[PDB]
Structure formats: C-alpha cells, structure tokens
Amino acid sequence: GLVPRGSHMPFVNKQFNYKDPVNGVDIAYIKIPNAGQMQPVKAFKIHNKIWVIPERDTFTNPEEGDLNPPPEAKQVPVSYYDSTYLSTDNEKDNYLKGVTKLFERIYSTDLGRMLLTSIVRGIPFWGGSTIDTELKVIDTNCINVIQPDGSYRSEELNLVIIGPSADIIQFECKSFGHEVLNLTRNGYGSTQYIRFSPDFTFGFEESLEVDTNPLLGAGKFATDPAVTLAHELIHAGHRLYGIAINPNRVFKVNTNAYYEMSGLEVSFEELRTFGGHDAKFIDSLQENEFRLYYYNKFKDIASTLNKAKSIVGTTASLQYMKNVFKEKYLLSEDTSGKFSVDKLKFDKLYKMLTEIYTEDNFVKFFKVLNRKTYLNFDKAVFKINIVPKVNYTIYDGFNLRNTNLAANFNGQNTEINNMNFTKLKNFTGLFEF
Numbered sequence: 001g002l003v004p005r006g007s008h009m010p011f012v013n014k015q016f017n018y019k020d021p022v023n024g025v026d027i028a029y030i031k032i033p034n035a036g037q038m039q040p041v042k043a044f045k046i047h048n049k050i051w052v053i054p055e056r057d058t059f060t061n062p063e064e065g066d067l068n069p070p071p072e073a074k075q076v077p078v079s080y081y082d083s084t085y086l087s088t089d090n091e092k093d094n095y096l097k098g099v100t101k102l103f104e105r106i107y108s109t110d111l112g113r114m115l116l117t118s119i120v121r122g123i124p125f126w127g128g129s130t131i132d133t134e135l136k137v138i139d140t141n142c143i144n145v146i147q148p149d150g151s152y153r154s155e156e157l158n159l160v161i162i163g164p165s166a167d168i169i170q171f172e173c174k175s176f177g178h179e180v181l182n183l184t185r186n187g188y189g190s191t192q193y194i195r196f197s198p199d200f201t202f203g204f205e206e207s208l209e210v211d212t213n214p215l216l217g218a219g220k221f222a223t224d225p226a227v228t229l230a231h232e233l234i235h236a237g238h239r240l241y242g243i244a245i246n247p248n249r250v251f252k253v254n255t256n257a258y259y260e261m262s263g264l265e266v267s268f269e270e271l272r273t274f275g276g277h278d279a280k281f282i283d284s285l286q287e288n289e290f291r292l293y294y295y296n297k298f299k300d301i302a303s304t305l306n307k308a309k310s311i312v313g314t315t316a317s318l319q320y321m322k323n324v325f326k327e328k329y330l331l332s333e334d335t336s337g338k339f340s341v342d343k344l345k346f347d348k349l350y351k352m353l354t355e356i357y358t359e360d361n362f363v364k365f366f367k368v369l370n371r372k373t374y375l376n377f378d379k380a381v382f383k384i385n386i387v388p389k390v391n392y393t394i395y396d397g398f399n400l401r402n403t404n405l406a407a408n409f410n411g412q413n414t415e416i417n418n419m420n421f422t423k424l425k426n427f428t429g430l431f432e433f
C-alpha cells in the first residue's frame with residue numbers, strides 16, 4: 001500500500017451520487033466560459049475551488065464538439081474512440097465515484113496533500129482590468145452556477161475535472177486564454193480543466209529496453225490511474241501559478257534512436273512534470289532563464305498589487321484580495337504595506353511546484369510500478385473499473401493487501417489480474433518505423 005500520513009479529513013466530504021438532487025450550491029447545473037452556447041450541465045463541487053463535470057468535453061473547444069472518430073483525418077495509432085462512452089447516468093455515477101476515489105488516494109499521501117493544498121491556494125490572479133490601478137477578476141476563471149431561484153451567479157474556481165473529448169485517451173490539462181495575456185506563463189494562473197477518465201488506463205512494459213522500444217511489448221502492466229491524475233494535477237499546479245513552460249520549448253530527443261528517427265520533440269513542460277532523470281534533459285542554462293523569467297513575472301504581480309487602488313465586480317475588499325495574492329505568491333510586506341518578492345521564497349515556491357511535485361515522486365509515495373521515463377512508447381489501453389473496493393482501494397490501488405495481488409505489483413499485472421482489465425487496443429506495431 002501507499003506511504004500513509006496518518007488520520008486526516010477526507011478531501012471529498014460527501015459521497016456524491018450522480019442522481020443526487022441539484023441544490024444550487026455543490027450539486028448544480030452550470031455553464032463554462034465561452035458557453036457558446038451550451039446547455040447547462042450537471043456538475044459537482046467536490047472540494048473548495050474544485051468541480052467535477054461527468055460529461056465528455058464538447059464544451060472547452062468549439063472545434064471539438066463531435067465525439068465520432070474525426071471524419072476529417074485518419075485515426076492515429078495512439079488514440080481510442082467510443083462516442084457512447086460516458087453518455088449514461090450509470091457511467092456518470094461511476095465516473096464521479098472513480099474521480100472521487102483517486103483524489104482521496106492522492107490526498108492520502110503527504111505529497112498529494114501538499115500538491116492539492118497548493119492547487120486550492122492557487123487562485124488565478126485578478127488581472128482582468130484595463131485600468132492598471134483597479135483589481136478585476138478575469139471571468140474565464142469563473143463558472144456560472146444556476147441557483148435555487150433559477151438565476152445564475154458567477155463563481156471563481158481553480159480546477160475542473162471533465163470527461164475526455166473525442167479521443168478518449170487524450171488526457172490533458174487545458175484552460176481558457178486571453179487575447180493579451182499568457183495566463184499560464186505570466187504568473188497569473190487560470191482555471192484549469194483536466195480532461196481525464198478513471199475508466200481506462202494504459203499498459204507499459206516492466207523492462208526499460210522494451211518499454212522504450214516502439215516495436216516491443218503488449219503492455220503487461222497497467223498504469224495506476226492515481227498516477228495519471230496526479231501527472232495532470234502537476235500540470236495544473238504549474239498553470240495555476242502561471243509558471244508553465246511554453247509547449248513550443250522542446251527537447252529534441254537525442255537519447256533514443258527511435259524518437260530520433262521520427263524526429264520526435266518533447267516539451268520541457270513534460271520532462272519537468274515527470275521529474276526523475278527526465279528533468280535533467282532541461283539544461284541548467286535554459287532552466288535558469290525560465291526561473292529568472294518567472295521571478296520577473298512575480299515582481300510584476302507584486303507591482304500591480306501595489307498600484308491597486310480600487311477593486312471592481314465584487315463585494316470583497318481591496319485589502320482582502322491583496323492579501324489573498326500576497327499569500328498565494330508568498331510575497332513580503334513592508335512596514336509601509338508595499339509588496340515585494342523574496343528571492344529565497346520565490347525559489348522555494350518555484351521548486352516545490354516543479355521539482356517536488358513530479359510523477360516520479362508520486363510513484364515513490366504510491367509504491368506502484370510505473371513507466372521509468374516519459375520517453376517511452378505506449379503499449380495498449382485497457383478498460384477498468386476502480387469503483388468496487390474488491391477491484392481497487394484508496395490505500396492499495398489494484399495491489400490489494402491480503403490477497404495474491406498484494407505482492408510484486410500483481411494487481412497491476414494485467415495477466416495475473418486479468419479480470420480487472422479489458423484490452424481495447426494495442427498500440428505496438430502501429431508507430432511509423
């Protein structure tokens with residue numbers, strides 16, 4: 001089982017059922033920004049600042065509202081399509097309970113407690129004003145919630161977990177942009193939408209030589225979905241603090257002849273998020289440039305707060321919100337009330353978000369088997385069901401104590417634990433080589 005942290009309150013106070021009656025507070029019909037023009041969807045607030053929408057994501061991107069295999073292109077090797085997935089109440093109930101269970105698995109570790117805490121504290125900055133002396137929310141960092149009287153109220157939030165779009169296995173952490181600001185890269189942060197499903201997982205190979213070869217292996221071991229969700233939450237952490245690395249900054253893979261012969265380039269953001277040996281492929285000089293860059297951005301935020309004389313679109317006070325961001329960014333405060341970025345403190349925060357919160361570290365806490373590198377090749381996708389405790393638990397994942405599955409990651413062994421996995425598609429021998 002996982003490395004415990006002791007008794008603690010659950011991350012999700014209520015055990016929601018999809019059919020629970022709306023109440024206009026934490027079970028509600030809502031609309032996402034853009035909302036162009038969507039029907040409200042039933043959503044669930046599982047924790048302060050965090051909502052779950054048990055629907056296929058046909059909302060965050062207008063060009064991605066069709067769940068049929070793209071009639072436009074031909075299907076990519078590593079993709080999976082099923083337009084019917086997550087269309088029924090039963091599936092949505094299971095989705096909710098699965099996502100809930102994964103949050104609790106994550107929160108049961110000290111590392112996950114730390115990451116989820118950072119995420120909740122990571123309110124997207126109030127940088128919406130055209131007047132540089134007035135604080136104003138950015139409304140794409142909100143959702144609209146239908147209240148008991150049928151009216152909408154605007155609510156700020158940090159994170160939404162939503163079902164995948166057409167390609168079921170294209171999990172990703174995404175967010176609404178601004179035509180002037182790069183919110184995920186300028187220190188501000190923005191509300192994060194993670195496309196994720198707890199109802200599928202990926203197979204990988206236990207031998208590094210096989211896992212990193214595109215032609216070998218059927219995907220004998222299954223990735224623990226808690227690791228997959230944590231990976232996306234790590235991205236969400238970077239993005240909420242506005243320190244994500246521009247996707248265009250890539251490492252030309254030159255440590256894997258197979259990547260090389262395909263000219264595969266992997267984002268630094270990805271290597272950072274994986275951690276371990278991968279993070280070293282970001283060279284000292286370039287990483288140092290990033291840190292300076294983000295340090296400067298934080299200073300600009302401190303400077304904006306200082307100039308702030310008024311606040312608009314809220315009842316909350318100018319003083320209260322100034323302090324919320326002093327707290328998010330760990331700013332220092334003068335005898336005269338001026339805000340400053342402290343260099344030790346910036347380094348500490350930046351490092352916590354980028355070095356401490358990594359996939360490789362979560363693997364250590366969960367004590368599961370996992371890919372050893374991001375620079376591998378996907379083997380297969382399986383259908384799973386982690387909701388029944390007989391299948392998967394908060395403490396043990398698939399590797400259930402006091403059963404044959406406890407030892408040697410037998411629970412993740414899709415051959416031994418075959419009843420828990422239905423292989424839907426092989427990817428090996430689909431790549432271009």
Ligand SMILES: [Zn+2]
Pocket residue numbers: 231235270273
């Ligand atoms: Zn990633």
